[PDB]
């Protein structure tokens, strides 16, 4: 459904928020087949596994050469750097306490920094993530006894203090 | 667009070494590209692939000219350099710097997410004059010449040799006085991927068995040109070698 917003339902994933964007993070072993969807990763690209996901924003693709072959290729507009698909315009962008993403406000594809919570781009530091600044959580955490929480530099819906994830139903329940 | 500018000496004396340089702009390290190479053409004759260097510093050379060829790259200066030893008058040719990139992703007949690698951008080339002083490979057969009237329709043919009925070929259009440009790739069915930039909708391709046809419809004056078909032999980015046909010269009557 186009761009990821606070209303997006991450299929088999969950919303995380940084200083400049929101994205879906996948569960357990799953990988992003699109910006909203997570599915099982395939280990070997073959004639049988074509079109299937083999990594975040990476799919097994048929190469129509002589002979035909198969490879795990990043989606259009991305390139494999450090065994992860990143936008072509972020290839040589070092953001520091953050990650490089495509600036949605610039009609020409451009790389900008989205920062860990507590940081924002710093014009004095080549627009890196080294300026202390507040980012108010925009997530609508409406599930049972859940609230927005900063965890490892990202905002995420998690159990309120005093509650834990029930091991049967995967809902937040009182510790006991 | 990716611009390729050839530079180097244009007059060489026999037995000397030729050193051509190519300066590329619009690509850095696999930003919609996998390599940069060289293709030459003796005046009025068939294209001949020479060498290729990948961005992983891998190299490929023409099997028959390997002992004479060296290719290097200096990414800091956006340059690749070809070196050809023991030059001979028959080596008189226009030398084209070429970029090998990947076709925009497409869905084929069976709905299979697909792409391919091809020589998608060509430099204008430089004419090097040398003063006086291959088994079990595909063979591409093209008729030497063709002719058509203005507004007519025509099918140029490119036939594969036996045992190569699954191979896809690329068509290249070389308007006179200008260098080749990619037109379309065609295999056993219809168009493979999409047509090159600047290629008008009046062009289409259809293949069956060993035949690979390029059809030009509503033939205008600017279709008068040499039409070359080539075939890449290699699995993936890989490129063992490249075959070319003799080329067809299309004359537009009227
Ligand atoms: C290619 O063109 C020739 C000449 O018009 C025709 O006989 C042949 O059937 C064509 N082949 C295909 C595959 O269209």
Place of tokens 């702009």: B25
Q: Please state the φ and ψ torsions of residue B229, each to the nearest 5 degrees.
A: -115, 135
Residues sharing a CB contact under 8 Å with residue A111, sequence separation 6 or more, in sequence order: A87, A89, A90, A93, A100, A101, A102, A103
Encoding tokens for residue A146? Answer: 């859940």
In a domain, A62, yes or no: yes
Q: For B3-130, CATH number? A: 2.60.40.10
Query: Rounded to a whole number, what is the distance in Å from the CA of B233 to chain A's nearest CA?
Result: 5
Determine the Cα–Cα distance for residues A101 and A57; give it in Å rounded to an integer: 14
Nearest to B171 by CA among B143, B147, B203: B203
Query: Rounded to a whole number, what is the distance in Å from the CA of A63 to chain B's nearest CA?
Result: 5
Determine the Cα–Cα distance for residues B153 and A21; give it in Å rounded to an integer: 54
Encoding tokens for residue A102? Answer: 């495509």
Encoding tokens for residue B247? Answer: 């080329």
In a domain, A3, yes or no: no
Determine the Cα–Cα distance for residues A16 and B159; give it in Å rounded to an integer: 56
Query: In b/e form, how buried is each residue of B178-201, taking b as 16+ CB within 10 angstroms?
Result: ebbbbbbbbbbeebbbebbeeeee
In a domain, A65, yes or no: yes
Judge whether B98 and B123 are in contact, CB under 8 Å: yes
In a domain, A2, yes or no: no
Q: Which chain B positions have a beta carbon within 8 Å of A76's beta carbon? A: 104-105
Determine the Cα–Cα distance for residues A74 and A97; give it in Å rounded to an integer: 24
In a domain, A128, yes or no: yes
Nearest to A141 by CA among A3, A4, A6, A1: A6
Q: For residue B35, is the peptide bond before it cis, meaning its omega torsion is within 30 degrees of 0?
A: no
Domain layout of chain B by residue ranges: 3-130, 140-252
Encoding tokens for residue B113? Answer: 């997410």
Specify the number of domains making up chain A.
1
Query: Rounded to a whole number, what is the distance in Å from the CA of A91 to chain B's nearest CA?
Result: 9
Measured CB to CB, residues of chain A less than 8 Å from chain B are: 50-51, 59-69, 71, 73, 75-76, 79, 88, 91-92
Chain B, 145 to 204: residues with Cβ < 8 Å from chain A are 166-168, 185, 187, 192-193
Judge whether B229 and B172 are in contact, CB under 8 Å: yes
Encode B91-148 in three state secondary structure.
HCEEEEEEEEEECCCEECCCCCEEECEEEEEECCCEEEEECCCCCCCCCCECCCEEEE
Element (H, E) at B185: strand B181-186
3-state secondary structure of A125: helix
Method of structure determination: X-ray
Residues sharing a CB contact under 8 Å with residue B57, sequence separation 6 or more, in sequence order: B73
Encoding tokens for residue A174? Answer: 């009182």
3-state secondary structure of B75: helix
Cβ atoms within 10 Å, residue B203: 18
For A87, B117, B185, B192, the CA distances from B103, given in Å and listed in that order, are 18, 6, 10, 9
Same fold, B3-130 and B140-252: yes
Long-range contacts, stretch A66-75, CB < 8 angstroms, 24+ apart: A66/B166, A66/B167, A66/B168, A66/B231, A66/B232, A66/B233, A66/B234, A67/B166, A67/B235, A68/B166, A69/B235, A69/B236, A70/A45, A70/A46, A71/A45, A71/B236, A72/A45, A73/B115, A75/B105
In a domain, A16, yes or no: yes
In a domain, A169, yes or no: yes
Q: Do A61 and B193 touch (CB under 8 A)?
A: no
Determine the Cα–Cα distance for residues B70 and B66; give it in Å rounded to an integer: 8
Q: Could you tell me the residue range of the domain that residue A72 belongs to?
A: 10-176
Task: Give all strands of the β-sheet with A154-159 in edge-to-edge order.
Answer: A22-26, A13-17, A154-159, A146-151
Q: Does domain B140-252 bear CATH number 1.10.340.30?
A: no
Judge whether A61 and A70 are in contact, CB under 8 Å: yes
**Closest ligand 1 atom number to CA of residue B207:** 13
For residue A156, the cross-strand partners are: A16, A149
Place of tokens 């390729």: B4
3-state secondary structure of B214: strand
Determine the Cα–Cα distance for residues A151 and A25; give it in Å rounded to an integer: 13
Judge whether B216 and B202 are in contact, CB under 8 Å: yes
Q: How far is CA B37 from the centre of its chain?
A: 10
Nearest to B13 by CA among B87, B82, B84, B90: B87
Determine the Cα–Cα distance for residues A145 and A141; give it in Å rounded to an integer: 9
Q: Please state the φ and ψ torsions of residue B124, each to the nearest 5 degrees.
A: -65, -20
Ligand 1: which residues within 6 Å by Cβ? B 155, 157, 206-208, 211, 213
- What's the N-to-C CA distance of chain B in angstroms? 34
B253 torsion bin: left (phi>0), alpha (psi -120 to 50), beta (else): beta
């Amino acid at each position: 459904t186009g761009k990821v917003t606070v209303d997006t339902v991450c299929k088999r994933g969950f919303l995380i928020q940084m200083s400049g964007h929101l994205e879906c993070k996948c569960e357990n072993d799953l990988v992003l087949v699109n910006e909203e969807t997570c599915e099982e990763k395939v280990l070997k690209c073959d004639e049988k596994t074509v079109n299937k996901p083999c990594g975040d924003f990476s799919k097994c693709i048929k190469i129509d050469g002589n002979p035909v072959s198969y490879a795990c290729k990043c989606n259009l507009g991305y390139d494999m750097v450090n065994n992860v698909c990143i936008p072509n315009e972020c290839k040589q962008v070092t953001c520091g306490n953050g990650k490089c993403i495509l600036d949605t406000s610039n009609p020409v594809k451009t790389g900008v920094c989205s920062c860990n919570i507590g940081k924002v781009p710093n014009v004095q530091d080549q627009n890196k993530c080294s300026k202390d600044g507040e980012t108010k959580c925009s997530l609508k955490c409406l599930k049972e006894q859940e609230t927005c929480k900063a965890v490892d530099g990202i905002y995420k819906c998690d159990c309120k203090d005093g509650f834990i994830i029930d091991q049967e139903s995967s809902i937040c329940t009182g510790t006991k | 667009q990716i611009t390729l500018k050839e530079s180097g000496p244009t007059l060489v004396k026999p037995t000397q070494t030729l050193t051509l340089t190519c300066t590329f702009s619009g690509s850095s390290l696999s930003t919609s590209g996998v390599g940069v190479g060289w293709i030459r053409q003796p005046p009025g004759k068939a294209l001949e692939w020479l060498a290729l260097i990948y961005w992983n510093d891998d190299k490929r050379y023409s099997p028959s000219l390997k002992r004479r060829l060296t290719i290097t790259k200096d990414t800091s200066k956006n340059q690749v350099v070809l070196t050809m030893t023991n030059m001979d008058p028959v080596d008189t040719a226009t030398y084209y710097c070429v970029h090998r990139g990947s076709a925009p992703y497409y869905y084929d007949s069976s709905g299979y997410y697909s792409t391919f690698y091809y020589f998608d951008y060509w430099g204008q080339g430089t004419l090097v004059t040398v003063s006086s002083g291959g088994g079990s490979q595909p063979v591409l057969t093209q008729p030497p010449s063709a002719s058509a009237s203005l507004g007519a329709s025509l099918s140029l043919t490119c036939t594969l040799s036996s045992g190569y009925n699954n191979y896809k070929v690329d068509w290249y259009q070389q308007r006179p006085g200008k260098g080749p440009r990619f037109v379309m790739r065609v295999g056993t069915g219809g168009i493979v991927g999409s047509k090159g930039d600047g290629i008008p909708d009046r062009f289409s391709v259809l293949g069956s068995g060993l035949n690979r046809n390029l059809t030009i419809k509503n033939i205008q004056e600017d279709d008068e040109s040499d039409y070359h078909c080539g075939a890449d032999h290699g699995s993936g980015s890989n490129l063992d070698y490249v075959v070319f046909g003799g080329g067809t010269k299309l004359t537009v009557l009227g």
